[PDB]
């Protein structure tokens, strides 16, 4: 159930260029004979994608990242690749996503799985039911914390006569999948051309994903030795992995409503021109498309090299306070203060700021700060605000309408109350 598989045939990873591949309908809207520009996570044109082989005993199935998305394409003839795995650590300590394809059905689970190294689906014969079953317990050992399950029709269906391209995304709470099946006769690498991927599902798993791995099948027909890193043979099935990025595309639509072409606006200045003119044809001439701007490299922070703390302690933790009609004023100057600690302190029942927020207050310099302090009762606290009326705001302490500062108050019944 957890056998290892450590055949040792080392070959370097290959790279290929994705000429025009990975385009998918961003929304479920119909468009015809129109050019539409949209920004979304796409596979840039002529992108540097890795290449992995499974030909004989060379197997390539490492754990790869899932930074923002994946364009997964597979040239197959025997459906050797059965599914994928998604997660952060791929062990029982965290939740993980699983996608596998049984004959004429799909199994999707979000459990805390404990995958063994070099997993895979096993195929054998059962001698009852008279049919070669496909038990999946080689992939994962245990399944804890299951929350989601789902079954549907095959995602993958029938040298390489067919091409299956997939697009995976991990948007806020939805795992979105776009797929396409294209027949081709090319056997070496990706066929240059164009083909759009139609969406398939959008699973609301709502988890965090950073790594992913692929699942393949093995052939042990001609003979079967004991379970070990041997006795397995993999037919010719290779796959390419590409990471998506936020990109602005200009999409074309035909009469039918299919895409059939597109343009990556940041590929080259000619693409910038095409996107600017909202056309795939550019007439002879000069066009203004963008603006060159040199960006800063680093920040420069300069302040006087002085060292002193503002005496907020003798203002807030003062032994006695003043009456509101004779409210005391303290002028704070020539010092450095941390308003973050003041805001952090939960001794205050009222902490309202105007024209500036306290979180963005410990990085702004002022020439002078005035600290007015007094004592009022509960229902009068609301009168200490710009544009308020009452006995206190009219006759005792009035705030301007352009006030820039914070109003802080706290219940002092334990200190400012007498039994009599």
């Amino acid at each position: 159930q957890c056998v290892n598989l450590t055949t040792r045939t080392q070959l370097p990873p290959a790279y290929t260029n994705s000429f025009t591949r990975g385009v998918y309908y961003p929304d479920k809207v119909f468009r015809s004979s129109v050019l539409h520009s949209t920004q979304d996570l796409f596979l840039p044109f002529f992108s540097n994608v890795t290449w992995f082989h499974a030909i004989h005993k060379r197997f390539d199935n490492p754990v790869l990242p899932f930074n923002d998305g994946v364009y997964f394409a597979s040239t197959e003839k025997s459906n050797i690749i059965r599914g994928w795995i998604f997660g952060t650590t791929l062990d029982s300590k965290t939740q993980s996503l699983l996608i596998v394809n049984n004959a004429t059905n799909v199994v999707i689970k979000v459990c805390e799985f404990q995958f063994c190294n070099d997993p895979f689906l096993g195929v054998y014969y059962h001698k009852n039911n008279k049919s070669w079953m496909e038990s999946e317990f080689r992939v994962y050992s245990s399944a804890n914390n299951c929350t989601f399950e789902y079954v549907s029709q095959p995602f993958l269906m029938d040298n390489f006569k067919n091409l299956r391209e997939f697009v995976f995304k991990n948007i806020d709470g939805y795992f979105k999948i776009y797929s396409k099946h294209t027949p081709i006769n090319l056997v070496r690498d990706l066929p240059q051309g164009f083909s759009a991927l139609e969406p398939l599902v959008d699973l609301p798993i709502g988890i965090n994903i950073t790594r992913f791995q692929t699942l393949l099948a093995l052939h042990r027909s001609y003979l079967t030795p004991g379970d070990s890193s041997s006795g397995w043979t993999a037919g010719a099935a290779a796959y390419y992995v590409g990471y998506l990025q936020p990109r602005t595309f200009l999409l074309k639509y035909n009469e039918n409503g299919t895409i059939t072409d597109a343009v990556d606006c940041a590929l080259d200045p000619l693409s910038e021109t095409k996107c600017t003119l909202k056309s795939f044809t550019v007439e002879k001439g000069i066009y203004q498309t963008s603006n060159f701007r040199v960006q800063p490299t680093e920040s420069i922070v300069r302040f006087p090299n002085i060292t002193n703390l503002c005496p907020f302690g003798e203002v807030f933790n003062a032994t006695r306070f003043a009456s509101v009609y004779a409210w005391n004023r303290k002028r704070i100057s020539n010092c450095v203060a941390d308003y973050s600690v003041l805001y952090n302190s939960a001794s205050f029942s009222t902490f309202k700021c105007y024209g500036v927020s306290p979180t963005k207050l410990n990085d702004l310099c002022f020439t002078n700060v005035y600290a007015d302090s007094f004592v009022i009762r509960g229902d009068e606290v609301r009168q200490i605000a710009p544009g308020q009326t009452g006995k206190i705001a009219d006759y005792n302490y009035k705030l301007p309408d352009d006030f820039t500062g914070c109003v802080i108050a706290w219940n002092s019944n334990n200190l400012d109350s007498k039994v009599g």
């Epitope: 159930q1 059962h126 001698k127 009852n128 038990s135 317990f137 030795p225 004991g226 379970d227």
Partner: antibody
Framework: VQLVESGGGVVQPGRSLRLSCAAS????????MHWVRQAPGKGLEWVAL????????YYADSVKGRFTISRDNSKNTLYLQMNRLRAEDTAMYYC?????????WGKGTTVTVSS | IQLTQSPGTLSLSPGERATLSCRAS???????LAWYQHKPGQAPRLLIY???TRATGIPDRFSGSGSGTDFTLTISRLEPEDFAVYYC????????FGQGTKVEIK
């Protein structure tokens, strides 16, 4: 990962006794299951094995024709039917899961063949 | 396949080195040779498989060697918990066990 045997006790020579092994905590239907016995103060003696799917069975030479091993994958149970018992079959019989070798062993059921 | 273990009884003290042997009447296929530990009143516990592969949780003072008909289990620095009966087993052609070696305190 737990195996609990049952059905032990005293049985008169020549009569029959059926042992059972209840499994939980693992994918029972994907493992071959063995029976092993150990006479008091003596060594381990393999008795029988049944494949994960119940298609293949094998028995020790000393019990061929007399013992039958079976399993029920829907109920996570393995059974050992012991017919025509001899005084020399008295032992503790262990239920054990195949990993091949056996990596999970039950506590064993004591079978005494006596009048 | 008959497995003959030797010696019948081994008497040592903690800290010493123990060597246990297992001989098969026929060559073991695929190095399918396993070692088991048994304490009184306890079920057996897997120590070694594949002639040389340590089982999960087994400390590195246990090591297995040998091939063909001749196999050895070595315990490099005996601990008090290591005093027990040891059985070898072949699983390449049916399933047969040795008669056991008792490792006792001298």
């Amino acid at each position: 990962v737990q195996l609990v045997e049952s059905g032990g006790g005293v049985v008169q020579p020549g009569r029959s006794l059926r042992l059972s092994c209840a499994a939980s905590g693992f994918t029972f239907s994907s493992y071959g299951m063995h029976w092993v016995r150990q006479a008091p103060g003596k060594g381990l003696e393999w008795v029988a094995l049944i494949s994960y799917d119940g298609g293949n069975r094998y028995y020790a030479d000393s019990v061929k024709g007399r013992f039958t091993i079976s399993r029920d994958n829907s109920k996570n149970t393995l059974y050992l039917q012991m017919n025509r018992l001899r005084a020399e079959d008295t032992a503790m019989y262990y239920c054990a899961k195949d990993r091949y070798f056996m990596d999970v062993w039950g506590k064993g059921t004591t079978v005494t063949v006596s009048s | 396949i008959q497995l003959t273990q030797s010696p019948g009884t081994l008497s040592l003290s903690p800290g010493e080195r123990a060597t246990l042997s297992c001989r098969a009447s026929q060559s073991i296929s695929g190095n399918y040779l396993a070692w088991y530990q048994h304490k009184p009143g306890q079920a057996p516990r897997l120590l070694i498989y594949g002639a040389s592969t340590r089982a999960t949780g087994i400390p590195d003072r246990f090591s297995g060697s040998g091939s063909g008909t001749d196999f050895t289990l070595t315990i490099s620095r005996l601990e008090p918990e290591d005093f027990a009966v040891y059985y070898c087993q072949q699983y390449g052609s049916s399933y047969t066990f040795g008669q056991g070696t008792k490792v006792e305190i001298k």
